[PDB]
């Protein structure tokens, strides 16, 4: 019976390929020919934030563009102050290995996870004057890679067990579970309308999900190797992905196809982080050449090369006001660019 | 006004306390060594862990007032190409391979080759722990299993002159075990720009001197790294 199913799957593949070909028109490059180049965007290290011992694996900003959270393999979760360049907290950790740190949208909780297969919730605005563990989410079988809050009580978490699940903090049970992938998912990025989320795995594909219905609306292909970082667009109609193939591509859900590719013949190492700007014109990426890069999203020319790190970069972040960019790297240092 | 001054003074005091605690933690974190245990199901990784003991599984032991930490990632799927990068700054890796069986020796060799040539693990040395010596000797001595069937190069190999067999031993088992070791050493010496080396050892089930071996290996690796950075041969 599986042979007949594969045959009709091939028929559906023919149909979808015909639709993709018929929906294609003149390339977006030919119409972007009329735009003017932006120029060389050069920014310097305004401040440096030292104090970490081991490498930095993740970083996330707050909602008021003042506080940021960092995670390291020592086991320290530090909350900094970008303006005064001084610390406010230092939470010890149980498991040293962590790949994710998150900040609540209202700035009351901070969550983290790693190889321990569990996600922890912390209390910041506590009345006892000390950070304590609130809940310990458990149930996944793979390692955690990315987790984000939704409003105050629901967190969407992705793991290497080929599945993504949504929890609720009050009772700690999986309300819904998504299973459409075949590799290991690594990234998440919630849409601005807070209705849909996209994911990317080690199968060179991206999946768009819906929280209530719980089904995969559409699937995108067009990459060779595994995907490492994903993001979103402020409009909510497009997103960009990075891969070990060392090329960046932009996908549009309205057209269900690919629009642009971002690569140069002199690059060998792959992308490790992607982060959009405020207006959506400046695209920032992180590579493994012990430096960073700046790209024009609408055009393709590489304009701007940040440098200063002694090891590979790990994280990238653009704040809500779009006034600073934070870059973390395995040299145990943090820098702020303006 | 004055309230703002009180606030920034309190913030500075918090910074001072946090910095002092961070310095205290840095004093301790730099004195403990970490090790990784990567092996196979047949290999007695749990057995050696238990010997030097007396999700991720930890274990503690200390020798000559030097602290040692080991890790065992034994709760994930088969794929390991992504979570193996989290051990980039680990002093050494302990590798356990079986020698009695011959079917998965090629798989073990492929694992070693993959580890030895990665872009984030080329500065990390390894410690071979060839195990199951009694089984290998008993099974080779009896017969009914020829190495030439699985490895058609045993006919052209001769015992090394530097070999030091245990005096109550038949030469054939020594030839076999040294051929097994020589294959791993041949994979090792092909690459490596004088930055990391592999230390071979022979280990059986009943062993009680395994901690000292890692002790001396770590000493050698530390001394080599220190000599490299001083431009002193």
């Amino acid at each position, epitope marked *: 019976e599986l042979d007949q199913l594969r045959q009709e799957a091939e028929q559906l593949k023919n149909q979808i390929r015909d639709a993709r070909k018929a929906c294609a028109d003149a390339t977006l490059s030919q119409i972007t020919n009329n735009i003017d180049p932006v120029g060389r965007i050069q920014m310097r290290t305004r401040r440096t934030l030292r104090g970490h011992l081991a490498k930095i694996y993740a970083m996330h900003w707050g909602t008021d563009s003042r506080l940021l959270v960092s995670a390291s393999q020592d086991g320290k979760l530090i909350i900094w102050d970008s303006y005064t360049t001084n610390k406010v907290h230092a939470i010890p950790l149980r498991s040293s290995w962590v790949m994710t740190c998150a900040y609540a949208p209202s700035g009351n909780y901070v969550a983290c996870g790693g190889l321990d297969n569990i996600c922890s919730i912390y209390n910041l605005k506590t009345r006892e004057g000390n950070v304590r563990v609130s809940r310990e989410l458990a149930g996944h079988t793979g390692y955690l890679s990315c987790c984000r809050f939704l409003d105050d009580n629901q967190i969407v978490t992705s793991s290497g067990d080929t599945t993504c699940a949504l929890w609720d903090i009050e009772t700690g049970q999986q309300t819904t579970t998504f299973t459409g992938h*075949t*590799g290991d998912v690594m990234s998440l990025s919630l849409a601005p309308d807070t209705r849909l989320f996209v994911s990317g795995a*080690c*199968d*060179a594909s991206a999946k768009l999900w819906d929280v209530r219905e719980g089904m995969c609306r559409q699937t995108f*292909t067009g990459h*060779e*190797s*595994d995907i490492n970082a994903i993001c979103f667009f402020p409009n909510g109609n497009a997103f960009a992905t990075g891969s*070990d*193939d*060392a090329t960046c591509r932009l996908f549009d859900l309205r057209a269900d196809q690919e629009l642009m590719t971002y690569s140069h013949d002199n690059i*060998i190492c792959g992308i490790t982080s992607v982060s959009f700007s405020k207006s959506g014109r400046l695209l920032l990426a992180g590579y493994d050449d012990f430096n960073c890069n700046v790209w024009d999203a609408l055009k393709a020319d590489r304009a701007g090369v940040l440098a200063g790190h002694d090891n590979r970069v790990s994280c990238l972040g653009v704040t809500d006001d779009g006034m600073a960019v934070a870059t973390g790297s395995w040299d145990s240092f943090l820098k702020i660019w303006n | 006004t004055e309230d703002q001054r009180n606030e920034e003074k309190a913030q500075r005091e918090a910074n001072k306390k946090i910095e002092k605690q961070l310095q205290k933690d840095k004093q301790v974190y730099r004195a403990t060594h970490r090790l990784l245990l990567l092996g196979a199901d047949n290999s007695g990784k749990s057995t050696i862990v238990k010997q030097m003991r007396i999700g991720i599984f930890e274990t503690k032991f200390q020798v000559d007032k030097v602290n040692f930490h080991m890790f065992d990632v034994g709760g994930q799927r*088969d*794929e*390991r*190409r992504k979570w193996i990068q989290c051990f980039n700054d680990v002093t050494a890796i302990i590798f356990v391979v079986d020698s009695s069986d011959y079917n998965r020796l*090629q*798989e073990a060799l*492929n694992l070693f*080759k*993959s*580890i*030895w*040539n*990665n*872009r984030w693990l080329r500065t990390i040395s390894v410690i071979l722990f060839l195990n199951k010596q009694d089984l290998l000797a008993e099974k080779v001595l009896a017969g009914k299993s020829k190495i030439e069937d*699985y*490895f*058609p*190069e045993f006919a052209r190999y001769t015992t090394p002159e530097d070999a030091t067999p245990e005096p109550g031993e038949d030469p054939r088992v020594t030839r076999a075990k040294y051929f097994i070791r020589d294959e791993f050493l041949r994979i090792s010496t092909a690459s490596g720009d004088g930055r990391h080396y592999c230390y071979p050892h022979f280990t059986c089930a009943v062993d009680t001197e395994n901690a000292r071996r890692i002790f001396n290996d770590c000493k050698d690796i530390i001394l080599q790294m220190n000599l490299r950075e001083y431009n002193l041969v």
Partner: nanobody, 126 residues
């Protein structure tokens, strides 16, 4: 999309010869390392042969050394595995796998329960 389709296969008495092939599309052939994987009943996946991008370094398993040989052709985008001096123990399903990372000399996985870049397989019976 990434697809890998194998070819060849049939009931051949010992002493026969077959030339297998895998057709690769959707990715640049010239910047990857390729291999062959077989699976016998009651057995796990095993590795057989490998070849670099140019075609300089060639290695085989100990089971087959002069019996089988491998070769590639960039212009036609297909890998070839020669088969000589067939034996009854060489009965399995053949996949033409590819290592994940580009411009590299080490590659993991290949032999796993569920890899990402592998074909459906071709059956050879002796």
């Amino acid at each position: 999309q990434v697809q890998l389709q194998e070819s060849g296969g049939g009931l051949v008495q010992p002493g026969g010869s077959l030339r297998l092939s895998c057709a690769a599309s959707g990715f640049t052939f010239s910047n990857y390392k390729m291999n062959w994987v077989r699976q016998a009943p009651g057995k796990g996946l095993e590795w057989v042969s490998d070849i670099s991008q140019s075609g300089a370094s060639i290695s085989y398993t100990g089971s087959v050394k002069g019996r089988f040989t491998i070769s590639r052709d960039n212009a036609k985008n297909t890998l070839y595995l020669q088969m000589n001096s067939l034996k009854p123990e060489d009965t399995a399903v053949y996949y033409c796998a590819r290592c994940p990372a580009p411009f590299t000399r080490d590659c993991f996985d290949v032999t796993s329960t569920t890899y990402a870049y592998r074909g459906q397989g071709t059956q050879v019976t002796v």
